[PDB]
């Protein structure tokens, strides 16, 4: 013990305040971030923890936070906590957007890294489902890494402001691109584009900017409660992107428009976004890898599964 308890091996030496701490890596001689997880009484927490560990251990990508080490007891009986060790990140996009104007070059670079990581995620048959500024970590040289796969789902199976319209009306990979579109909007103005105060308010905010959906888009909504809801709303005209973002690069707004497309079947794909003129300085498909290994219970089995998943980091 070396405090409540935050007991992290010989390897992790200094300390600054499941809870998170910065700490000194005595091997790699860089400081690191350590998340103390205590999930084992709660089936729900065991689920999120298992999913996040299984996903992060399979993934190897520059724009996805890796797991460098896992600290736990050598036996299931003694394992009450798990410590996840990750690269120390200066900041996240949430904190950055609270006080910093982003240059066009930073917006372009951040967007490119987000999309590059998301291409990899999607190629593994994973949906993130909770992309938001606080889940995007930056280091001091503006390298960007995607955080938090606790809520992730297989493509064959969240936070209101970034939620796609079809989540309220109806699903696919397209959910994540909408979130990215919301984040780009937020990078352009330093304010959330759709700050809904409740579930249906989020739809009112989207339609306030996009305008009322077309007959063609509504024809795609087969759920009657959802379609009739949309038909009950007063008509709204589209607000042009250049009215909202008079300073913005016209290529950025073109791409924004294609990401914030109401109909998920018409919405731009991640790989089409990467190939958009806005990202031409960065785009290099051979340097935009896909996953080698795409993805295909009570407390006690999940605890056992978390034990097994974490075995590779043990001295053996």
> Which of 69, 92, 148, 176 does the annotation list as catalytic?
148
Q: Which residues of 179-193 are buried (b: 16+ CB within 10 A; e: fewer)?
A: bbbbbbbbbbeeebb
Closest CA to 193 of 209, 177, 175: 209
Closest CA to 259 of 94, 142, 111, 102: 111
Q: What are phi and psi of 248, to 5 degrees?
A: -70, 145
19 annotated binding-site participant: yes
180 annotated binding-site participant: no
Whether residue 116 contacts residue 274, with contact meaning beta carbons closer than 8 Å, is answered with yes
3-state secondary structure of 238: coil
User: Does the annotation count 92 as an active-site position?
Assistant: no
> Which of 87, 92, 130, 217 does the annotation list as catalytic?
130
Whether residue 15 contacts residue 23, with contact meaning beta carbons closer than 8 Å, is answered with yes
251 annotated binding-site participant: no
User: Does the annotation count 25 as an active-site position?
Assistant: no
Sheet holding 144-146, edge to edge: 91-92, 136-138, 144-146
98 annotated binding-site participant: no
User: Active-site residues: which are they?
Assistant: 130, 148
Q: Which residues are annotated as a binding site?
A: 18-20, 35
Q: Which residues are annotated as a binding site for ATP?
A: 18-20, 35
């Amino acid at each position: 013990v070396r405090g409540q308890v935050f007991d992290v091996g010989p390897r992790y030496t200094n300390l600054s305040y499941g809870m998170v701490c910065s700490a000194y890596d005595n091997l790699n001689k860089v400081r690191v971030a350590i998340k103390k997880i205590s999930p084992f009484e709660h089936q729900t927490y065991c689920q999120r923890t298992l999913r996040e560990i299984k996903i992060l251990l399979r993934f190897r990508h520059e724009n996805i936070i890796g797991i460098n080490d896992i600290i736990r007891a050598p036996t299931i009986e003694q394992m009450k906590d798990v410590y996840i060790v990750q690269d120390l990140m200066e900041t996240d996009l949430y904190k950055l957007l609270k006080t910093q104007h982003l240059s066009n070059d930073h917006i372009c670079y951040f967007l490119y890294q987000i999309l590059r990581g998301l291409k990899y995620i999607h190629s593994a048959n994973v949906l993130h489902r909770d992309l938001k500024p606080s889940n995007l970590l930056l280091n001091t040289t503006c390298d960007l890494k995607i955080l938090d796969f606790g809520l992730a789902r297989h493509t064959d199976d969240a936070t209101r402001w970034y939620r796609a319209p079809e989540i309220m009306l109806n699903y696919t990979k397209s959910i994540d691109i909408w979130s990215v579109g919301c984040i780009l909007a937020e990078m352009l103005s330093n304010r959330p584009i759709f700050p809904g105060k409740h579930y249906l308010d989020q739809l009112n905010h989207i339609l306030g900017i996009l305008g009322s959906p077309s007959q063609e888009d509504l024809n795609c909504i087969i759920n009657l409660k959802a379609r009739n809801y949309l038909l009950s709303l007063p008509h709204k005209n589209k607000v042009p992107w250049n009215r909202l973002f008079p300073n913005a690069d016209s290529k950025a707004l073109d791409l924004l428009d294609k990401m914030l497309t109401f109909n998920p079947h018409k919405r731009i794909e991640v790989e089409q976004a990467l190939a958009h003129p806005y990202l031409e300085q960065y785009y290099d498909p051979s340097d935009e890898p896909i996953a080698e290994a795409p993805f295909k219970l009570p407390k006690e089995k999940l605890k056992e599964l978390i034990f097994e998943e974490t075995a590779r980091f043990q001295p053996g």
